Amino acid sequence: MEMEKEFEQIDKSGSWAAIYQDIRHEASDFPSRVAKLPKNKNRNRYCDVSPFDHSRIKLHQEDNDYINASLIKMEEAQRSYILTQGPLPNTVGHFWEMVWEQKSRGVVMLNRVMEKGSLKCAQYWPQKEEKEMIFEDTNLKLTLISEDIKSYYTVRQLELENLTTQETREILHFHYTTWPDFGVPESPASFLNFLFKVRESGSLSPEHGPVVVHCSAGIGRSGTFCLADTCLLLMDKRKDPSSVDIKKVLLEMRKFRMGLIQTADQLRFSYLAVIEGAKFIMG
Ligand SMILES: CC(=O)NCCSSCCNC(=O)[C@H]1CC[C@@H](NC(=O)c2nccnc2C(=O)O)CC1
Numbered sequence: 001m002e003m004e005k006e007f008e009q010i011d012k013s014g015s016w017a018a019i020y021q022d023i024r025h026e027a028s029d030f031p032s033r034v035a036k037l038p039k040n041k042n043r044n045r046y047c048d049v050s051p052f053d054h055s056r057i058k059l060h061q062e063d064n065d066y067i068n069a070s071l072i073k074m075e076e077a078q079r080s081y082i083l084t085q086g087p088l089p090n091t092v093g094h095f096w097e098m099v100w101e102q103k104s105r106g107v108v109m110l111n112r113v114m115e116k117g118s119l120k121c122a123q124y125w126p127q128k129e130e131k132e133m134i135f136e137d138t139n140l141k142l143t144l145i146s147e148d149i150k151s152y153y154t155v156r157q158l159e160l161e162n163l164t165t166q167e168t169r170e171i172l173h174f175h176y177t178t179w180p181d182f183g184v185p186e187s188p189a190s191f192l193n194f195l196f197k198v199r200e201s202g203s204l205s206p207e208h209g210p211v212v213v214h215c216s217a218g219i220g221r222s223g224t225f226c227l228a229d230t231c232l233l234l235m236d237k238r239k240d241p242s243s244v245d246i247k248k249v250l251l252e253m254r255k256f257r258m259g260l261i262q263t264a265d266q267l268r269f270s271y272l273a274v275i276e277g278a279k280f281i282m283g
C-alpha cells in the first residue's frame with residue numbers, strides 16, 4: 001500500500017519529528033472560554049488540555065454544564081467519539097452523567113489508574129459486584145456486573161442506573177491495560193485487537209450514542225484509538241483505499257479537540273496501527 005511506502009520514506013529519512021511539527025503548526029486553533037472560567041478550574045486535570053467551546057459536551061444541568069470532553073464528529077466515516085480526561089475525584093459523577101445523557105454504550109480506557117507511581121485517574125468504577133457506587137451529585141448508581149481479564153485488556157459489564165427515573169443501561173468498559181509507561185507499544189497487534197473488540201460489541205455503532213474514550217488527558221493514546229479506527233473504516237468505505245491520508249484525517253479530528261497524538265512516536269505508531277490493521281482486512 002502507498003501509506004506503507006510513505007511510512008518507509010519517513011523512516012529511512014528519519015523525519016518523524018518534522019512531519020509531526022508540520023501537523024502541529026497546521027492544527028486548528030479555537031477558543032476554550034468555558035474551560036478557562038475560574039469556577040471550572042477544579043474540573044480540569046491539565047492547564048494545557050482544554051475542550052474547544054464549539055465541540056464541548058454539555059451536561060444537562062442548569063448549575064454548571066461543564067465537563068472536559070469533546071465530541072469528535074467524523075462526517076465521511078459516519079463515526080462519533082467523545083474524548084475526555086480521566087475523571088477527577090470531583091468529576092466522577094459528571095463523567096457518568098455524560099455517559100448517561102449522551103446515551104453511550106461503551107467506555108474506552110487506555111491508561112492504568114496508576115502509572116509511573118502516580119495517580120492518573122480516579123477509581124471511577126466499582127471493583128467488586130457487592131460494592132456498588134452511588135454518585136450523589138448526579139443521582140446515579142453504578143454496579144459491576146461481570147469482569148473478563150485478558151493478557152492485554154479487560155472488559156467489564158457495568159449497570160448504570162438513573163436513580164431519579166429508575167431506568168437502567170448496560171455500559172461496556174473496555175480497559176487497555178498494557179500501554180507502556182514510557183513511549184509506545186512495539187507491536188500494534190494488541191492495540192488493534194483491542195479496537196476490534198470494542199467494534200464487535202456495538203459500542204462504536206450509530207444505534208448508540210458516541211463512545212467515551214479517555215486516557216490521562218484524553219488526547220494522546222485516545223487520539224490514536226480514534227485515528228486508527230476512522231482511517232481503517234475509510235479504507236473500507238472509499239473507492240481507492242490508498243486515498244486515505246492519515247495526516248489529513250488527524251487534522252480533521254484536531255478541529256474538535258486539541259493535541260490528539262502527543263509525540264512523533266505516537267504518530268509513527270498510528271501509521272503502523274493503520275498499516276497493520278489494513279493488512280488484517282486486506283490479507
Ligand atoms: C494548572 C492546572 O490546573 N493544571 C496542572 C497540570 S497542567 S501541565 C502538565 C504537564 N504537561 C504534560 O506533560 C501533559 C501534556 C499533554 C498530555 N499528554 C499525554 O497525552 C500523555 N501524558 C502522559 C502519559 N501518556 C500520554 C499520552 O501520550 O497519551 C498530558 C500531559
Ligand SMILES: [Mg+2]
Pocket residue numbers: none
Ligand atoms: Mg468475589
